[PDB]
Structure formats: structure tokens, C-alpha cells
Amino acid sequence: MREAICIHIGQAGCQVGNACWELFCLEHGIQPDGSMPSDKCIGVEDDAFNTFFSETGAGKHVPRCLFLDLEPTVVDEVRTGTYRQLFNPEQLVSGKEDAANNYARGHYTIGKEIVDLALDRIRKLADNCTGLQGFMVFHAVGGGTGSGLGALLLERLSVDYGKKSKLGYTVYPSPQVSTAVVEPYNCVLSTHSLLEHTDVATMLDNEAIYDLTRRSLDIERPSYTNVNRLIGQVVSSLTASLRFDGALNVDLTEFQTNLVPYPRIHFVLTSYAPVVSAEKAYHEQLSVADITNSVFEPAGMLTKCDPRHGKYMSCCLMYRGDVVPKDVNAAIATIKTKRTIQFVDWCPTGFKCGINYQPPTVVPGGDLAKVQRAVCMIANSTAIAEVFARIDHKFDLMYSKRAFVHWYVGEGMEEGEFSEAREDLAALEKDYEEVGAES
Amino acid sequence: GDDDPRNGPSSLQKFEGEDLDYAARKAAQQRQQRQWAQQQVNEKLAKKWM
Amino acid sequence: REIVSCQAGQCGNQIGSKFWEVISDEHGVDPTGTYQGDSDLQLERINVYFDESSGGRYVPRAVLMDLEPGTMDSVRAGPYGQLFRPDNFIFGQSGAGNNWAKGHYTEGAELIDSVLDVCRKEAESCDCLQGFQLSHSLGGGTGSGMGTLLISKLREEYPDRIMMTFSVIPSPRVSDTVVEPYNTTLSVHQLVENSDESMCIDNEALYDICFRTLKLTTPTFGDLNHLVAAVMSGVTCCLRFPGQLNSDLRKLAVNLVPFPRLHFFMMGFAPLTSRGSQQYRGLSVAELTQQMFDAKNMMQAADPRHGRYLTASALFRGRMSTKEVDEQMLNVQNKNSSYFIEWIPNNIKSSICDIPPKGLKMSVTFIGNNTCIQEMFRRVGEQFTGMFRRKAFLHWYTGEGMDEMEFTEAESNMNDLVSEYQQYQDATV
Amino acid sequence: REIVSCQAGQCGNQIGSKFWEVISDEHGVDPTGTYQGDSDLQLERINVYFDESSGGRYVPRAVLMDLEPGTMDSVRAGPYGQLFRPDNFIFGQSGAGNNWAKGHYTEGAELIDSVLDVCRKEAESCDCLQGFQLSHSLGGGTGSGMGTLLISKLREEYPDRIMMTFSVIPSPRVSDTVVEPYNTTLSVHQLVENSDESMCIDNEALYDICFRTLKLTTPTFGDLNHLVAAVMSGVTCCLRFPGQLNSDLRKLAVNLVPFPRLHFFMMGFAPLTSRGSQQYRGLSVAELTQQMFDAKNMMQAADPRHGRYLTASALFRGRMSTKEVDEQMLNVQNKNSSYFIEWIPNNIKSSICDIPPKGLKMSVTFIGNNTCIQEMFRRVGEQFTGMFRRKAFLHWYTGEGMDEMEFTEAESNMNDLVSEYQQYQDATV
Amino acid sequence: APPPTASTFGIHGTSAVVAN
Amino acid sequence: QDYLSDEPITLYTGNPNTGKTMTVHGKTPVDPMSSSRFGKHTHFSEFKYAY
Amino acid sequence: TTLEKQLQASTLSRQCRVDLLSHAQELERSSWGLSKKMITLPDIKLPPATTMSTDNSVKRSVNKERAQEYTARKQEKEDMISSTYFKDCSHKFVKGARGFSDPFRTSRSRTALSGRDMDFVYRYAEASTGSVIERPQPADDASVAATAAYRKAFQQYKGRLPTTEEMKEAGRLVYAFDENGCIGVIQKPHSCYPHMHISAVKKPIRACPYQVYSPEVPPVRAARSEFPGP
Amino acid sequence: PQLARNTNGALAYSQRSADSVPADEDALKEFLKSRGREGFAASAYWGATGE
Amino acid sequence: KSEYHREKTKPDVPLRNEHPVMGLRTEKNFVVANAVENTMAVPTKVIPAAQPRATD
Ligand SMILES: Nc1nc2c(ncn2[C@@H]2O[C@H](COP(=O)(O)OP(=O)(O)OP(=O)(O)O)[C@@H](O)[C@H]2O)c(=O)[nH]1
Ligand SMILES: Nc1nc2c(ncn2[C@@H]2O[C@H](COP(=O)(O)OP(=O)(O)O)[C@@H](O)[C@H]2O)c(=O)[nH]1
Ligand SMILES: Nc1nc2c(ncn2[C@@H]2O[C@H](COP(=O)(O)OP(=O)(O)O)[C@@H](O)[C@H]2O)c(=O)[nH]1
């Protein structure tokens, strides 16, 4: 068992899923056609692909994934792409008219009429499933379908699956770079769903990914392809503990306990190292201590947040490859002893460690340089309220003149919704800073 | 010697962790990463050239 | 006289696998179950740990526990994993998540019925069960919760049997889990109530042994489990083999437990030396007694020199002279009375086992009821108070229905134990 | 000393076919009817189940019944179909339609005359028979209806001789129809005062026997039927083979029926070992008795925690000493006497037979009269009250000449039986 | 009487692939 | 382009040149034909699609 | 056959026949007096479709005397029931071999929280309110006897009267009488559930003078709890 | 060749000789194996022979 | 339209001033308490009791 159901919503979520699945196929040996080499004896057979792929009578290895987009463009291009015979013709839902970066339209008018069969497909996946570890959602709250429709799906999943774990990777608007102008509206309106119907939320804004790619990964023209590849790498690193063997195997509900101290407190930071190119890959020493230091560098997170502008609460480190407990303990000790990184006074340990024997894989033409050892970070820290501060300031600038609100009003949303989301986000940031407040 | 017949797990004087091939494994890891990194820097040069 | 062992959780199961490898090597049992021992002493008392089958296969008296089936699968894949009986692998579908509440009330309870069935049947298979053994980690969820739930229902069924628990208490700088203080605090009072003798293990001092005594360049969990298996096998040396001065688990308990709540022992092993320093070391009773009392040699992260030894026990193995094995104890008492408690004269018990581990002329396991255990308990208490003050991670535990009042119960019981050790340390004649 | 058997319904026919295969294998009778056994003990008492013809063929003493001729064709085309007498295949044109009324009043009656003709012919053809056996399922139409009609007519005709019936009581978790409550109630209130003794079968327990004891891949109905066949063979082994401690069906009836209405028994088999764990466990009298009294080993799905053994009976086969086959019964009677009742002391009947089932050096069949057997009756009665309270599916039964008074009387008798079992379920000392 | 469920008719000209 | 072909050599893979491999806990039975040996082969505890 | 007709046709003596008949009737009378589950009846205001039917069902319709016979047999049955057979046997023993219960055991019960829990919740209230709370003087005979015994033992050990804080110990102890008849405590209490005494010989225990509570069978989950397969 | 229960360790102690560590590898193999076997003698009748 | 959900099912975070009860260490002399425990403890014997005869 130990399988999780992946859900991808919006152009951004669909491309995240495309990168994740092209990584997982190479991770487990499934070819783009959907077939992987198999044994003859029934006793000896690995099921490391069970977490992501479900076997079929015809030998196919269908991913345990759903794609959902109101705009048919991305899903149709996937249907015409390389993995056409990999991805199921169903569970690849297509709409007819997009949300047009409108949370109200994606949550009340157009999201309503497609979420109905979205739950049908998700529950079909769950019925095929037998050991569900959780739901594995990828989207961007910047737009309409990613925010409104993703939200709607989140509360329907919560109401029809009880306390099943949900891991939501959301591409928040960056502090200073964003595609849309109503993007702050969409993000703020989605904050409620990300707060109430998301057990753990991960921040994946594009600003930090672009800067990390330019600085360490050393690319002139970072693109959505590269950022989705990085997101796929971080997702694979997080799930590799239950995917493969390791000295300290950790499961989804296993590290949720060590990551989330309070139910309202679950929006966590993420980082990956060594995220380096071939240029520095054979010039800088990549030991366990060095990769841990690079992880805890406050310029290396996939989210552009400064841990020094807050204080850590719980760091979960997914070590993979050459890693050994005797070195990860020393890395934890040196992280503790250096004072540029602080923890809350009420969490003395503050560290969860999971060691996996599988070194991370790469992709053809991979921007990541292949390394024998790596480590991922999932950190709950009080500094995450700062990106919420940025986004609500954008929202306040937008909403002072009540601009771009007529679309939401005409798509069936009350104006008071903006207010409700505003005090909800304010309460969230207050709760964060109060968690970080000294006793 | 390192091939003592009478030091099994029960005697506890021959451990599994001394790791006598530690230096050799480091050298092999280092050569492997040199091959990988040279190949990938060639790939990066090819990407720029293309 | 038979002892049946149960290993719970990832840590406990791997420790038990290494321990069973050690015992099978001791008794000349290869992984397929046959007996290729070189002497009949390994066959005389092979019934203590192994039960013979119809075909002569020696099945270990072992019961395996977890919620994650991966630990069972890895144990079966282990070199000696084919020794264990297939039905003794009891496992669940979802792990405990380091959550003592799931390990003790919801997932453990719904799974422990078959565990008790297996333990009961294997206990009744024994002619006269000498005791029950447990190996688990307090920091973990299924190791601590399910192990405590085991011992709670084993003590009630067998009140007079020796409960031989090996609990791996997490260390601060060795920690890899944040709810470890919670699990340890919730398990300490259960250990106090339902364990004839609890002999603690700490990875801090285990790594200290591996790095300074053995000078291993990269010790993994296997070396730590080997060090634990050392004492796990040495505590029953007199049980499995003859000796000049025999002993057993109950004799050790009566000589090491002055009061019912004072049954937490800090241990050690000897001889242990690095590969390069082993040809320079002349094995002797003096060297063994030097290494057994060394603070660095202790596999607990509680400094022996800070506290005072309530009781000590020397399970010496091998052919050695009795007046000197007794003299190395009386002399150390006489020259270090400050390290021992005054009102308990003759703090050291010594026992001799005829057969040492093969390849060793003689060895020794040290069992110490030092009053310094309250320090390593007080460290956990400080961590628990820090986490509990701000309701940190209480929602995960209260999701299963466990109570803040029960958290307070655990804290109060642990504080009572710590103050018990402190008061018996500073009590005078 | 012989038993003549009848199969009713599809379930009963399949179970009887498997039972006859097992008996023919034990007695060395190949499907063509000849004898190839390699012992005189197989021929000395082969007349218990087989009658010799003019040509030496051994025709089983079996009467087959089903309104559906499809199962008749299947059983006669099976591997052992040619064994049975052609005239004993008694069948109708239209099936019972899962209707107790149709199988007991309308269609069963028109065929029960020829059925009794065949059974009377066989009974008078053989010399002096211990009694009648029947195999059927209570959840069916003709297995329950015609089975109960057959039992009533045979009690009319031969009350001198014993009556044993194997009824497969359905379970909601195995329920493949909707009229289990009606059929089961209408059959049990018959068997209470008609069948001399009725041991219970549940497919729910049969399924997880194949898991907690066999761990096999694909369990089918034929796989299930072998358990029933093996327990039947163990029950009637002593009539066919010698033993140190001999017994027969009347002996079991006397030792297991304290009161006439308390004749429903809970039954099990041992050993039940898996292929993987076959060599791991060492089979002995202790393990056999532990498996006998293990709750999960029962092949009826009622929990024995909630009831107390009225009586118990262990029918051992093979080569074992007598003092350690009585001492283990003493051992259980002492260890877990809470299973037992004080007003009836020494609740265990024992028998020893020298011939074990093929493939066993030791084996045993366990038949228990417990106060927990009313759990299935309570659950079926709850379903019956739920269905009958709204008159659901009652028009089918009322249109076949039956009235509501039959259902009312069946419910009253079921409640009386449940209450008289629950009399002694209290754990008095 | 509720509208038919999972209906493919009446969706033409509307942004719905299924109807209710 | 031999990246996905060769596998990183670790403390846990052993040294292919020397042939000595660390024998650690937490290793499942190996099938030498999948993408990598470090694969959660759960046949013993999870007899998949049966029972 | 009915039992009366069966013995009419059988080969018993008349006295033996009436003896077996009387045994059966007394068993059935005890069964009648025993408690049941009520015979359920069709509900009031039942759907009409449950009763009224179709021509197909009246085509497949295939009794008054049968019902009258049923009612007559039932009526004579309850008439006979309306118109002690089972007796208990003396388990008592002669003087000098009798067994006596424990008044401390009678006082103690599962429902009431133990003395250790009582003291713990008193300490909890003390800590929560921040003020010292006075422990009420217990009026139970067992409690006062235990308090007196603790005070006497403390006086015998230490030559002074104990303080109230030190007398707070009497609450958190389980007490029992010994053979000599003096009040004492159990250092290693045994479970109320049946347990094992492993001396040189291994022996059952239902009730021993070493248990806190009265003997009770342990509640165990049903073996057939979940579906047999995954 | 299983060693008997009443194995006389005094005989083995008389047999062992000082400065008798072989140079060659299989000789060391056998000598250390014999040393391992030597440790299975019982102290209660260590020198007892019944003469 | 999809119904608006304003629910706040997840509990509010505890305040830093809000704290549980800590400590509760039994402020009593442990050595004296244990000594009195031993003095007043009754003997216990796992030996089978003197069962009365069947003639009793
Ligand atoms: N990291 C990452 N971010 C993306 C990617 N694609 C889009 N984004 C960002 O995520 C936001 C989501 O907006 P859209 O791409 O329109 O997604 P959407 O709202 O579901 O699409 P519509 O329903 O048609 O409005 C955009 O504003 C982008 O800035 C991607 O592939 N990777
Ligand atoms: N000595 C030793 N310690 C271990 C081993 N495995 C885990 N641990 C320790 O156990 C702690 C975590 O326990 P965990 O795996 O959660 O226990 P579980 O939940 O019961 O399986 C870690 O801090 C490790 O230091 C082992 O094989 N040997
Ligand atoms: N053990 C066993 N049970 C069976 C078999 N065939 C049917 N059953 C059970 O019997 C029930 C149906 O009874 P049915 O065959 O219709 O009875 P009939 O109408 O009298 O033949 C089902 O719920 C099955 O579980 C069999 O071959 N073996």
C-alpha cells in the first residue's frame, strides 16, 4: 500500500503534475508508454511504484493522479503529448470555459459544474486505492481555477473524506513578480480554504525559485519548465521515504505530527539542496553537513521568506543517499549551535529526520546536477506570516478603491467576502506571531 | 587480523561498522561524480550553444 | 526456565533482530534453523530462547510488533530474519506517526489482541517461563505506546514473572523527532508500574562508545543494536550456561532493586576496544573491571560520577579466578566509597558464568542502579515542560481522545520518580 | 455402528461431495468404487459409510437432494460422481427459489415421499445403523426447507437412532441473499426439537480460518468444504478405526447435551497450519489443544469470549500417550476455567483413536456446547425482527400456504433458545 | 422532480460537460 | 548521457569496485531488474492483490 | 412427533414416562419464567402496499383448521404453564475450613476511582486553583481503619506523630487483612482478571487475597471483528 | 565432533604453548578456531578426571 | 451556486499566557514513606493455598 492520490488544478498545477510525473516515471522505470519491466516469479516483485502508479491487466502503470483545468488547452496538449498513453483518458478532466483569473467564477459558477464529476473521479481513484496515505494537491492561488476551483475541491474533499491528510502545494503570488493584477484578490480569497481544508500547506512562489535557479542552478532563462522540475524534485524527495527504503522511514501522517503544532498553524516553508549545477557540482564539497547548511541557508528556500525575520518551530529534513545518522546528528548540532537560525523556546528538539537509501534521480537535460546525497526541508516557522503580510498589503491597495470587485460581485459572490478573507488572513498572521511570541 | 574466525557477532570484537573500504568508497564516489559533472557541464555547454 | 522476547517498533524490532543474530551465533544456530554448534553446552539450554519444531528447526521465542509493515519486511529480509516464525509477525496498515495516543489507545488497541494471543500461546508453550523480555524505543510511537500496552496486560496475567524491558530513551542532540519528550513522559510511568526491571538505552552514549571506545569511522544503527544485543544476551548468560556462581533475572532484580519504584538500571559492557588497540590490550579481570565502571563505557547519557551507586551487578562470563573477580569489586568499593551509597554496604553483586562468548577468553556485563538516572529523566522533564507549556502538538494526541489530565499524570509520575532517586541519593545514615 | 448421510441443497450437496471424497481417500476407495488401501484397518470397518455390491463396489450410504437438477448433474460429473448410487440422486424440475415455504410445503412435500423411500430402503438394507447425518445450509430454500422436512420425517420414522446435521448458518458479512433471517429462523426452530444434535457452520469463520491459520491465496467454496469434511471425518473416525479411548455419536450426544433443547454445538479442527509456517511450528498435544481452544480457530463465527462452555469434547486421532492427552484437557480446564461452568464440573469429554487423518501424525476434532453459540441466533433474530416488523418479503412465504403464525412461533422458539443459552453465560464462581 | 443526473443533453451552448 | 543508467554509489549500495557492502537494517528483498534496489518491496507483509 | 405421543409410542414404564414428561415440562416452565426478547409484531400505520396485492400474486396463491389447532395447542400450553424443580447445592464448608471475604474488597469497586487517583485529582485541583485544599476526613469504615493502621505503623517506625501531609499517604494505598487479622497493604497487587501464579509449579488464580478488586472476567474484543479479508 | 559436557580444560591448557602463533594464513585460521573451541570447558570439573 | 462556508472548525491557537498545570510533584518524604510501606505491607505467597478437603 502506502499510496497517495495526486490532484493537479489549473495551468500551474497541471504543469507541476506534468513535471512530477515525468520525474516519477524515470524514478520507478515506467516508460512513457505506461509499461515497465516485470518479473516472472510472483514472489519477487517490487511495489515501490504502488505509491504513485496502479497496475493494470494490460501491463499499464496508470498514475494515481487527476488533472483538472477549466481551460481545455493544457489537458488537450497533454493528451497530444508524450504521455498520452500513460495518463488515463479519464481522470484528465477538461472544462469548456476557464475561470479567467476570477475566484468567484471559479468557485461559484464554473467550478461548481465540473467539481461534481471531479469528486466522482477522485472517489474512483480512492476506490482503486487501498492504503491511502493522503491527497497530494498542486495548484496556484494566483489565478481563478487554481484558487476558486482548487478551493471548492478542497472543501468537498474535506467534507466527503473526513480527516484524511491533505498536502497542498500552492504557488503564492511573489512579493514583486506576478502574472495577474487580480492575483492578490484570488490569493486572499483562497486563504480561507487553504486554512480550513488543508492539513499541510506548502508555499511555492516563483520569485525564490527564479532567484535560486539564477544563483545556484546557473540558468540565463529560467522557465516554468525549470520551476516545475524543481517542484517535482522537492515532491519526490518528500515522498521518497514511503516510496523506498531508508534507515528512518517517515510517512505523511507521521511527519504531520512533528510538523504541525496547532491545527491553524500548518503553512510551511520548503527548500532543497544541493540544488546546484554541474559548474559548482565538482567544485564545492557536497557532504551531509554542507547540504544541510545549504538547506538552512535563508536564500535557498522555494519560498522567498527570511527565517531570520521570524523563528523556527519544526524542521523536517528528508535526507537521501549517502546520508548516515552519525552525520545528520552533527548537522543538526551545528544548525542548533549557529545563532543565525533560531527556534521557538517551546520546541527544544524542533527537528524531525528521515533518512532514505535512494539518491535523488535526474531527468534528461536536467537542470539539476546529479548528486549522490541530498536533503529536503519542510519547515514550519513564524516568518511565514510575512508573505501573508505582503499579499494582504497588495489586497489592501487593490481593495481601497474597490477595484476589480465588479467581476466577483457579478459572478455570484457577496462583497463582504473580501472583508471576511481579510480578517481571516489577519487572524492567521496574528496566530503565527503569537505562536512565535516568547512566553 | 581482520579475518579472525572466532570473532562473530556474539564476541562483539568484530563489528560491522569499522568500514575498512571507507577510503576506497570515497575515491570511487569522487571519480563517479567527476564523470557525472563533466558530462553535465558538457550538456550545459551544448544547451548554450544550441 | 524460559524467557520470551517481544520487540516493538522500528528501533525495537531491529535491536531484537541483532539480538537474535547474537543469540543464534552463541548457540550455533544458522538462519535456516538447524544447529551447527561446536559443543553440547549450546544445545543443553537452547530451549531458553528457542523452541524446537518437528523437523528440528529452532524457532526463536520472539514476538514482533509494529504498525508500519516495512519494519517486519526488513526484519524478514535480514540475514537472520528467516529464523522467526511467520505468524509471529504482527503488523498494521498505518504507522503510529510517533504518536503515543495512536500507539496506546486506537491503533495499538485494535491490533494488540492477536499480539496477546501469540504471546499467551508461546508463554504456555514454555515448560516454566522464567520471564518476558521487551525491546522498544520510548521516543517512537508504536515502540513506546504498544510496548507499554503490552507490559500492562502482561503484568496482570503474570504478576510474578520478570519483566525485562530495554527502552531506548531519546537524547537531545541525537533526537530526530519533536514529540519524543511526550512519548517518553507518557511511557515512563507505564514502565514504572509494569516492569520488574527497566534497563535504559541511549543513542548518545551508544555513539560515544562507537566513536571513542571502538573508534569506528561510520557507525550506523547496526553497531548500536549490536551494543544493545551484547547486554541483552549477557544478562542471561547464567540462565543459558553453567558457572561457578550462577544467577538469573530474579536474583539480579532482588540484588539491584532496593525499593519497587527504583528499578531503572544503567548498563555497560566489557571488553570493548578499537581495531588498532586490540593487540596492545591484555585481557584480564582487572581490565574488565576497569572498563565496566568507566563513565565513557556506560551506554547511558547520565554521568555516573554525579550520582551514587545504589546497587551494581557484574555478570562476568568465562573462566576466571573467583577471589580476584570478587576482589576487583571489594577493592573498587573500598577506594571509591564516595561513588557508592553508605547505608547500603557491599553495593556490588558478582556472578560468574562458565561459558563466555566464543572467541573471548572472558567478558562482563555491568548492571547499575545508579542514582544518576534522575538527571537523564530530568532532561526529558525539562523538554516536556517546555513543549507542554504552550500546548505544542497537543492536538495530535487529543485527536485520539487522550487527555491533558493524563499528560499531567505522566509529568507528575516522572517528577515523583526523579525526586525519589534524588532523595535516596542525598539520604544519609 | 453405521451412519447414512443426506445432502440437501447446493451447499449441502457440495459439502457432502467433499466429505465423501475425504472418506473415500481415508478408506482407500477410488472413484470407480474399488479398494486400493494398504491396511486391514480400512476394510475392517468400511461398512460404516459404504455398502458392498455384487461386484465388490463400495457404494456410499448417501442420499442427494435438490430441487435444482443442475447441482445433481455437477456432482455426478465431478471426480467422485460415479461413486454414488444412480437411484439415490433425487431431484425436482423447478428449484426451491430460496423459499423455505416452497421447499417445505409445496415442492419439498411432492419429493419427500421418494426421498423417504430411498432413505428407508438404505436403512433397512444395512444391518444396524448408529444413525443419520445431514448436510445443508439454513440460508437456502431447499437446504433449509427440505432439510428440516427430512429431519422431521426421520424423527417420525427412526427415533431410536442418532441424528446429526451440519447446518451452514449464514452471516450478514457473507450474506449473498436477503431472506437469510426468514430461512434461518424457519429452519432453526425446526432443528431445535427435531435434530438430535446440530453443530453450526459459518462461512464468515471459514474465510478467516484460511487467513489466521492457512494464509492461502484463493479460498473458494470447495476450499471451505474440506474443513467441514475433515471435521466430519474426525467426528466419525472412532466408529471406523480402533482407539485407546473409544467413542461414538451417542457418546458425544450424552456428554455434550445436558438438556434436550441445548444441542447446538460450536465446532473446530486442529491442526490448521499454513504452508509457509508448516515446518516452523512443532506439532504436539499442547499445540493441538491450544488450537482447539483458540477463538479464531473455530469454523463457526460466534465469539466465545461472551459465553461459557456448557460442555466440550475432544476427539483425538493418531499416536499419542493418554496422560498427556488428558493432562492438556486438565490444563485448559484449569488455565481458562472462565470458559467453563461450575455446576457441571469436568466439562471435557475425550476420545482417542489410533488412526489419524491422512497427512497427520496427530489430529483432533473439537465439538463444544457453549452459551456463546446464541450470538448467531441473536444476530439472525435481530435481522428477522427488522424484516418481519415491516412485513418485508412475507408475501412470497404466505403465497405458498404458510401463515404468519409459523413465523411468530419460529421467533418465539428462537427467543426461548437464545434465553436458555444465555442462562449460564454469566461468569458465576 | 429533480433534473436528470449526469445528463449529456442540454449542455450544448453551455460551459458544462455534464448536467447536474 | 549515461545519467539515469548508472546509480550513485553510497554507504548502502556498497563499492562496486571493491565488492564490499555495508549490511544495514531497513533493507527489503532485492529484485535486480527494477529502477533501483532501494525499492519498498513489501511482498512478505503485503501479499498484494490476493488473500 | 410431540413428546407426549413419543412416550406413548415408546417402551418405558408408566412411571418412567411420567418422569421424563415432568422433567420436560419443568424445563419448559423454567424457560417460560426466564427473560426473553419480545416477539416483534407488524407496525401500526403500516404501508397499504405491504398488505394489498396484485393479480399475479393472487394467481400464485395455493388453513383455518390449522390455525385453530395452533391456537388450541398454545392455549393449553399457557394453561399448563399457569397451573422448585431445579435446586442449588450447598457449597458451604464446616467450621475451621471456611473462606472469608475481604471487607476492603467489598468497599473497593471498579466504578469508584482508586485512592491514588483520588490523591492525584486533589493535587490537580490544588495546583489549578493555586490554593491549599483540605482533604475531607473520610467516614467510610475501611478508610478510617486504614488511616488508623497507617498512623499506628508510622508511630511504630518513627517515634513521633505524623503530620497531615504525611498522612496523605493513607489515601494512595490499597489495604487488606492478613491471616493474623491485622490491617496491611499490598505492595504488588494482582489483577481482578484471572491470572497465573508461577511458583515451582504454575497454577491458575481466579480470586486470591492479592487482588485490589473482586474477580471479573476480562472484556475481550470479538475475534471475528473485521471482514476476514482486506 | 561435538565436545562432551565434562570437557577437561586442564588438558587443553597443558596443550597450549607460548610463542606458538603461526605465520601462515590457514594455520592461523585453524589455530584460532581451536582457541574458540577451547572456551567451552566447564569449571566445576575443570581438572577432574576420575583417576 | 456553491454554498459559502464561513466555518471555523479548526481550534484557535492557545495564548502564550494560557498554560496547563505543571509539576504536581508529591511533596512527601519518599524514604520514610517507603519504609512505612514496607513495615505495614502484608506477606504475599504465590504458593497454592491450603484447599479444604472434600470431607470438610
Ligand atoms: N511555479 C509555476 N507557476 C506557474 C506556472 N504556471 C502558471 N504559474 C503561476 O500561477 C498562477 C496561476 O494562474 P494560471 O496559470 O492562469 O492558472 P489558472 O487560474 O488555474 O488558469 P485559468 O483558470 O485559465 O485562469 C499564474 O499567475 C502564474 O503566475 C507553472 O507552470 N509553474
Ligand atoms: N540504537 C538504535 N536506535 C534506533 C534504531 N532505529 C531507531 N532508533 C532510534 O529511535 C528513535 C525513533 O524511534 P521510532 O523509529 O519512531 O520508533 P517506532 O515508532 O516505535 O518505530 C530515533 O531517535 C532513533 O535514534 C536502531 O536500529 N538502533
Ligand atoms: N461452505 C460452503 N458454503 C456454500 C457452498 N455453496 C453455497 N454456500 C453458501 O450457501 C448460501 C446459499 O445457499 P444455497 O446454496 O442457495 O442453499 P440451497 O438453496 O438449499 O441450495 C450462500 O450464502 C453460500 O455462502 C459451498 O460449496 N460451501
Ligand SMILES: [Mg+2]
Ligand atoms: Mg489557464
